Design a protein around this ligand. Structure first.
Ligand SMILES: Cc1cc2nc3c(=O)[nH]c(=O)nc-3n(C[C@H](O)[C@H](O)[C@H](O)COP(=O)(O)OP(=O)(O)OC[C@H]3O[C@@H](n4cnc5c(N)ncnc54)[C@H](O)[C@@H]3O)c2cc1C
Ligand SMILES: Cc1cc2nc3c(=O)[nH]c(=O)nc-3n(C[C@H](O)[C@H](O)[C@H](O)COP(=O)(O)OP(=O)(O)OC[C@H]3O[C@@H](n4cnc5c(N)ncnc54)[C@H](O)[C@@H]3O)c2cc1C
Ligand SMILES: CCC/C=C/C/C=C/CCCCCCCC(=O)O[C@H](COC(=O)CCCCCCCCCCCCCC)COP(=O)(O)OCCN
Ligand SMILES: CCC/C=C/C/C=C/CCCCCCCC(=O)O[C@H](COC(=O)CCCCCCCCCCCCCC)COP(=O)(O)OCCN
Ligand SMILES: CN1CCC[C@H]1c1ccc(O)nc1
Ligand SMILES: CN1CCC[C@H]1c1ccc(O)nc1
Lengths: 425, 425
């Protein structure tokens, strides 16, 4: 038997397992899939042989993400600036300016006033307390309704909505205004910071860090899917799909939130958590890598398209590039290549789409979703508690971070907290 | 004897006298000088024969100034857009961008945060209550100290300070942060609006409106300086410099705040007002019209110069223009033409200064100052009360407007209030 069993081998599980190991604990890491990294997934491009791409998480910012910064420094993992935006091809109407910040002077006063309203609302959020413990229910409304109340002129209105669509991976009518404000708060109460934190990338892929961390974990079982966690006895019993059970004093659930409903917990998780766990979060983010010909370097497009954003990702050759589009899987079907061409051509009518690459995170049984985004009404009911221990079972991961939800930093933050909690007990 | 004596023939006095006249009252307007208009003073340029210029108040914004808008519509007074800024010659350091809004992307997050802090502070101000009645004393501190606490990076820091210097007519160490916030509040809680309200000018000079209003005032005495206002009897007695006294049931003091100390009030004004009235406000604004050769059209300069701002005013010929500089008379001596040349050349090294034109409002005994700006500590002690009636004596003018202080709109607003008060009594 083990001191701790960590379930899930993404950054959260990896940090938890490594730090407990170095603290002298006997740890077993159970990973359901054939690889480590989870939603950090670098691999060879489906479109360009020999080209490594990020199919999940890619972007980081050292100042917004200090734990991640420490990991990179620890293993000497090289980072590079993310692709620079130099050519702006927005779809924000005839008054937009072709810059990264496309707001014209005629909208400046309106933007100034909305910024105050937005930041005032975000400042209501204390990041330690949980979104359910702060009387924030009035803000937990559909984002389109919240934005309607800001009464923004067309360029700034669509610019905000486009980035919010990108960021939350939800259309405006499904996104929670409160969650948008949570992201603003998480970035040091900055609206700008939400986009400006797309600062750097792993030079050699996120697998660089995954591998560096996994090397310090002595016992890892791949292709081992946990189906049950039973703490009714003195020692927690962890049952697997097609294998013998494992036992530990403590268990860290470091699997995606939308997969918890598939695990049989004994006894049942606290009542307050059950409904949201059953439902799952409403995150439907879809990141599509688009292999193109005819695109100039440094393109950024933001607009009212079915792709709210489309921007430069990678130079392939002098004539070919990868662009990246963010949308959501509820609104867009990436198996419809005709739809992809139309979505790209809307912004870039001169460009030829050669192929696309993505992972359907929502269809993957080890994930059942991309990054976290609550449905309207979910997180003002229960939020902090989703990441709280249930007896000897700890819950970690980006999905439950109060400080950096939906980011790699959040996976590392939550793992830190679980590790500290276990070492004090 | 009269129903009302109005002392002072600027826009405040003119509106008061006209509106009381049309309400059927018997009014006498006493003007100390040889002209009507006060700090709205259009006349022939000292530098360019046949060119009419504004030596006092010039700029207006119909949306920020609805009473002024009504006056223009009433008399069919033509307005024109103020000179457009198309060429930017800032002195804000090497990272500034040559645009009207010269803040670079690297300062965007800092600007966003400062905007929130600024607007949050301005939102503490209720424009009806008075700056002395709202526990705002913590904000009534030197502007340089307040701005220091914002910790702005160099471009935005100097851009804010330059405009604040321009606007308040006070150097940062003498300006009150609370007053800066008052101006922000007055512009519908907008920092941007403070500068964006320099929107329009009188096509034919402010005298167009002065004359239109004065035509409806039947009894006006020019060169009649009031030295005493005595309400100890049943009827107010108004004594003049070298003339016989005049008598009225009511008296409207529509003279600049810094001149009230020269009038003998009987009985003495309420105690709370006396010290500030004696002291006078700290407004030292200085508007200099600079006749130049070699300047391209549409110049705007903002920077760390002794002229915080220098911008296009009037096309004189294909080679000659007037620019306008704002500074303050404490910091700058406009009788030193060598100093003017240096101040202009700092921004515009290719330009030749041909001459200057200004009025020394601070030295003029009918004014003793340009527009109002309190000394640190003044208006958190007494503000609203300066514009409150003392028995049958009413106090009006831009200087005492709570809603639009230092603007023509403020003169019209205060006059409206006095007129309404008199008609109800
Ligand atoms: C499309 C996309 C783009 C992203 N872009 C960024 C970005 O730019 N910047 C950023 O910081 N973050 C980004 N992220 C978010 C970030 O990648 C994730 O939130 C983070 O990597 C998750 O780490 P984690 O440890 O919480 O969970 P995961 O990485 O999801 O790890 C969970 C692990 O649990 C395993 N598992 C699931 N069920 C079981 C089971 N029952 N038994 C055993 N194991 C199981 C899975 O195989 C997986 O390995 C992105 C995510 C997506 C989906
Ligand atoms: C340099 C400068 C630039 C300006 N620019 C603008 C601008 O761009 N936009 C804007 O809206 N405003 C501007 N203003 C502010 C605005 O012009 C004034 O605040 C406004 O015109 C004042 O109107 P008022 O009726 O309150 O007082 P005033 O116009 O000052 O009228 C007071 C009158 O009282 C008379 N008087 C003084 N003492 C006596 C006495 N004892 N007896 C009898 N009469 C007396 C004076 O002669 C004067 O006519 C500017 C002001 C200055 C000085
Ligand atoms: C009493 C103190 C006064 C202090 C005033 C300082 C600020 C005055 C700013 C005045 C300049 C505004 C001009 C508008 C820009 C423009 O037309 O040029 C625009 C540039 O685009 C913008 O203006 C968008 C910016 C919106 C930001 C809103 C929040 C800013 C808050 C201001 C904080 C001030 C910094 C100090 C901390 C481009 O062109 P066109 O698009 O038309 O094509
Ligand atoms: C979770 C929802 C996410 C919503 C995000 C929407 C806003 C994201 C904006 C991201 C783009 C920022 C890029 C910075 C601009 C730049 O580099 O280009 C700059 C342009 O200059 C500026 O950025 C100054 C603007 C400062 C304004 C501060 C307040 C803005 C508040 C934002 C409100 C958003 C509008 C919706 C109401 C020029 O070049 P360079 O100078 O470098 O030479
Ligand atoms: C940084 N966020 C966290 C989850 C998804 C990711 C992301 C990355 C780039 C982009 O354009 N939008 C969102
Ligand atoms: C509009 N304000 C009111 C008083 C002075 C005036 C003003 C006009 C132009 C400018 O650049 N600064 C200040």
């Amino acid at each position: 038997m083990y001191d701790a069993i960590v379930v899930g081998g993404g950054f959260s599980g990896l940090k938890a397992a490594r730090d407990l190991t170095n603290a002298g604990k006997k740890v077993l890491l159970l990973e359901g899939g054939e690889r480590l990294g989870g939603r950090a997934y670098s691999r060879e491009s489906r479109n360009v042989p020999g080209l490594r791409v990020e199919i999940g998480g890619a972007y980081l910012h050292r100042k917004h993400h200090p734990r991640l910064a420490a990991e990179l420094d620890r293993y000497g993992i090289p980072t590079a600036a993310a692709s620079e935006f130099t050519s702006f091809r927005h779809r924000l109407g005839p008054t937009a300016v072709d810059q990264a910040f496309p707001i014209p002077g005629s909208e400046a006063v309106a933007v100034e006033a909305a910024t105050y309203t937005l930041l005032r609302d975000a400042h209501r959020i204390d990041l330690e307390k949980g979104l359910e413990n702060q009387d924030l229910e009035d803000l937990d409304i559909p984002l389109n309704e919240y934005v309607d109340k800001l009464d923004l002129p067309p360029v700034s209105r669509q610019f905000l909505l486009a980035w919010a669509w990108n960021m939350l991976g939800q259309p405006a009518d499904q996104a929670s205004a409160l969650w948008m404000l949570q992201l603003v708060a998480a970035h040091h109460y900055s609206i700008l910071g939400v986009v400006l934190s797309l600062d750097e990338v792993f030079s050699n892929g996120s697998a660089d860090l995954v591998d560096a961390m996994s090397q310090e974990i002595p016992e890892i079982r791949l292709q081992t899917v946990v189906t049950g966690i039973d703490q009714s006895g003195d020692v927690v019993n962890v049952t697997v799909k097609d294998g013998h059970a494992f036992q530990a004093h403590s268990v860290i659930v470091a699997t995606p939130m939308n997969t918890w409903r598939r695990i049989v917990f004994t006894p049942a998780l606290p009542e307050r958590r059950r409904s949201v766990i059953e439902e799952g979060h409403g995150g439907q983010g879809l990141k599509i890598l688009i292999h193109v010909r005819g695109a100039e370097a440094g393109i950024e497009c933001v607009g009212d398209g079915i792709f709210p954003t489309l921007y430069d990702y990678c130079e392939v050759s002098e004539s070919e590039r990868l662009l990246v589009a963010f949308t959501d899987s509820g609104s867009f079907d990436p198996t419809d290549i005709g739809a992809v061409k139309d979505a790209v051509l809307y912004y870039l009518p001169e460009v030829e789409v050669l192929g696309i690459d993505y992972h359907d995170w929502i269809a993957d049984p080890l994930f059942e979703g991309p990054w976290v985004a609550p449905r309207v009404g979910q997180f003002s009911r229960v939020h902090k508690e989703l990441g709280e221990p249930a007896g000897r079972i700890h819950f970690v991961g980006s999905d439950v971070s109060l400080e950096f939800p939906g980011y790699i930093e959040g996976a590392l933050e939550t793992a830190e907290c679980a590790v500290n909690a276990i070492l004090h007990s």
